Structure 1
Amino acid sequence: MLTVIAEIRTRPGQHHRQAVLDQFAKIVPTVLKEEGCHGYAPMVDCAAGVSFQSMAPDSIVMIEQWESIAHLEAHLQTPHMKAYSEAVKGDVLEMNIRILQPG
């Protein structure tokens, strides 16, 4: 029902983006098992050499589906997400989070 697209902007260079991705690798199976989660995928740009593509190498884009806002909010308080946030605090600069419905 809700679709979340979250862009996580990482610090340039020094394998910061990979550090974050590695933290997601630890957590994604767990998140998929959370109540109300119907998708949770960290994505990165893939250079297709087409003129219409825009790329941001220092970013990870999450695509997620949650049954409700309550389920998303619960997600954010889980220990795996608190552990994730602590683990990536020196790697992440900001997040831009959209909550979307069918248009």
Structure 2
Amino acid sequence: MLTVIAEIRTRPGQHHRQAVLDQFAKIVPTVLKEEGCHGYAPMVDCAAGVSFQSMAPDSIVMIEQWESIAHLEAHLQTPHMKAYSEAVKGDVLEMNIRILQPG
């Protein structure tokens, strides 16, 4: 019912962003079997060469679906997320979490 778009801003420069994606590669199959999870995808800009596109190369955009706030809050306490957090602490600068519903 809830869609989460979390933008993760990574440190510029030498594979900070790929290191974050590599952490996601380890965890996404597990997140996706989490209870309440109907989607969890780390997306990056695709350069399309069109004027109307905005790009942000030090950015990963997470598109997620969660059945409820309770399920999202359990998700954040799971071990794979505390492990992720620990592993990316030198590569991430911030994360902006929106929680959305059909408008």
TM-score above 0.5, yes or no: yes
> Alignment length, in residue pairs?
103
C-alpha RMSD of matched pairs (Å): 0.3
Partner of 1:91: 91
1:8-29 per-position Cα deviation (integer Å, ceiling 9, x unaligned): 0000011000000000000000
Q: Percent identity?
A: 100
1:63-91 per-position Cα deviation (integer Å, ceiling 9, x unaligned): 00000000000000000000000000000
1:9-64 per-position Cα deviation (integer Å, ceiling 9, x unaligned): 00001100000000000000000000000000000000000000000000000000
2:24 paired with 1:27:
no
Q: In structure 2, what is the Cα distance between the partners aligned to 1:28 and 1:95?
A: 17
> Which ranges of 4 or more aligned residues in structure 1 deviate by more than 2 Å?
none
Q: In structure 2, what is the Cα distance between the partners aligned to 1:50 and 1:70?
A: 40
Classify the secondary structure of the residue corresponding to 1:55: coil
Where structure 2 has 5 or more consecutive residues not aligned to the other structure, the ranges are: none
What is the TM-score normalised by the length of structure 1? Answer: 1.00
